[PDB]
């Protein structure tokens, strides 16, 4: 974890973990709030 | 043919001569560096123009500089 977490903090893994979370969030926004063309707020 | 010019920023690192594939460059004595030598191009008519010397020059910006001018059968690299 002095070097395992260093590998986990690298540029491709952190891009995979962020965009996995980012596309995971935007899909789950698009399930409970789908077809969103106009922001009502 | 091609005009190879050496400027006073040269440190005499000799690697422009070592990268030369047609024996254009040679190291002459000089008083402007720690190595006390600068490059020169006496056989610049034999220059193909490949700029291997410019790729091997560590000085920023380059001390050896090759200007592609009139091209003859020396600087075209032909065998026919």
């Amino acid at each position: 974890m002095q070097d395992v977490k260093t590998y986990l903090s690298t540029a491709p893994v952190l891009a995979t973990l962020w965009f996995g979370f980012l596309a995971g969030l935007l899909i789950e926004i698009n399930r409970f709030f789908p077809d969103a063309l106009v922001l009502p707020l | 043919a091609h005009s190879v010019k050496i400027y006073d920023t040269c440190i005499g690192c000799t690697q422009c001569v070592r990268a030369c594939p047609t024996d254009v460059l040679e190291m002459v004595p000089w008083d402007g560096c720690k190595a006390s030598q600068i490059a020169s191009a006496p056989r610049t008519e034999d220059c193909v123009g490949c700029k291997r010397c410019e790729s091997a020059c560590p000085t920023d910006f380059l001390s050896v500089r090759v200007y592609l001018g009139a091209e003859t059968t020396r600087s075209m690299g032909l065998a026919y």
């Binding site: 903090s9 540029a11 063309l37 106009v38 009502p40 | -």
Partner: protein, 160 residues
């Protein structure tokens, strides 16, 4: 506005709702009514009917094509088409731009500044990703204090 009828009273927008369910109802005719693929088309129809009842209730403008058009001029009726989600976007996009700028300042004053960009320091990153919440007050604050911009005497400029 701009020759566009509202979508709640548009006959072309109601025609597209009619011909979309009818396309999905004819897809439902070749399945059993309690089958698993028929539940997906039944959920598709309720997703379609939720969509058309949402577009008409937001004051969207529908043209002669029966399609909702966005007015991006800054109309008081049409704020949620461009102005409201644009300010929502620029806050999020400025959040990305402020925590990436503040990370580079935090790693430029380090021992090996290039190893902190291939290997992103997550305790250093996550302590300023929270700090990107209040970024218009920190970007114009750095603009007014002169820390946002660099003077041109310390900027690498290609020669003329």
């Amino acid at each position: 506005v701009a020759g566009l009828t509202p979508c709640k009273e548009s006959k072309g927008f109601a025609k597209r709702q009619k011909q979309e369910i009818k396309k999905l109802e004819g897809r439902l005719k070749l399945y059993a009514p309690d089958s698993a693929p028929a539940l997906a088309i039944n959920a598709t129809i309720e997703k379609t009917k939720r969509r058309f009842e949402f577009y008409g209730n937001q004051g969207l403008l529908c043209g002669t094509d029966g399609l909702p058009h966005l007015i991006v001029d800054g109309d008081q009726a049409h704020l949620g088409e461009f102005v409201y989600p644009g300010l929502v976007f620029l806050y999020i996009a400025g959040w990305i731009g402020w925590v990436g700028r503040a990370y580079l300042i935090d790693v430029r004053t380090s021992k090996k500044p290039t190893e902190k960009e291939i290997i992103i320091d997550v305790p250093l990153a996550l302590r300023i990703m929270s700090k990107g919440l209040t970024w218009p007050v920190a970007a114009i604050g750095e603009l007014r204090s002169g820390k946002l911009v660099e003077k041109s005497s310390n900027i690498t400029v290609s020669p003329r």
